[PDB]
């Protein structure tokens, strides 16, 4: 029952992730930082191409 114990919170955290994923897309012309959660940014000299 450890799968029924541990992955139950992993189900609801994935279920809550589907709630915030609806929030981010918003308007077409929405934001330059709210779109900076899914698509990534990094430190200096990461993107080679």
């Amino acid at each position: 029952a450890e799968f029924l114990s541990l992955s139950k919170a992993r189900i609801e955290a994935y279920e809550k992730e589907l709630e915030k994923m609806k929030n981010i897309i918003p308007f077409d012309q929405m934001t330059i930082e709210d779109l900076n959660e899914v698509f990534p940014e990094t430190k200096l000299d990461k993107k080679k191409y």
């Binding site: 077409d28 012309q29 929405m30 934001t31 330059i32 779109l35």
Partner: protein, 56 residues
């Protein structure tokens, strides 16, 4: 002796007026947006860089 060209003698002047305004002025022709979708006049400046950044 049909078509006689002419010429005018006049000094051709590369003078030196106030330069530090004239240098700064082609910076303000290019804006920079803090938005995701832009406004269709920066968007063809932003595309023109992403060509010739892929050759140097």
């Amino acid at each position: 002796n049909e078509n006689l060209f002419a010429s005018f003698i006049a000094p051709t002047m590369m003078g030196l007026p106030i330069v530090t305004l004239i240098i700064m002025f082609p910076s303000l022709l290019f804006p920079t947006p803090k938005r995701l979708i832009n406004n269709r006049t920066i968007s063809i400046q932003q595309w023109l860089i992403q060509l010739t950044s892929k050759q140097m």
